[PDB]
Amino acid sequence: LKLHDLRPARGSKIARTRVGRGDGSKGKTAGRGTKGTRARKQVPVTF
């Protein structure tokens, strides 16, 4: 009863990763690090 009693099952919802938001998380390169192709583009799988 009482919609303020419904909650999701544990582990079903996790927070997304926000990737360009300071040093305490994926810092400034947002997990890329590099300076080459992969810093700005994707490499085709066939390559």
Partner RNA sequence: GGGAUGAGCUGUGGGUAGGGGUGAAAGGCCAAUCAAACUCCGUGAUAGCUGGUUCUCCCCGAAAUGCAUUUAGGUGCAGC
Q: Based on CB atoms, which residue is closest to RNA, 8 or 22?
A: 22
**Interacting positions 17-36 with Mg ion (CB under 5 A):** 28, 31, 34-36
What does 2 bind: Mg ion, RNA, none (CB cut-off 5 to 8 Å by kind)? none
Rounded to whole angstroms, the Cα distance separating 45 from 12 reads 32
Q: Does 38 bind RNA (CB under 7 A)?
A: yes
Taking the CA of residue 23 as centre, how many other CA atoms within 13 Å lie in the half-sphere pointing to its CB? Answer: 0
**Rounded to a whole number, what is the distance in angstroms from the first to the last CA of the chain?**
57
Which two structure tokens, joined as six digits, stand for 19? 């990737």
Can you give the binding site for RNA, defined by CB under 7 A? Answer: 18, 20-25, 27-30, 32, 34-41, 43, 47
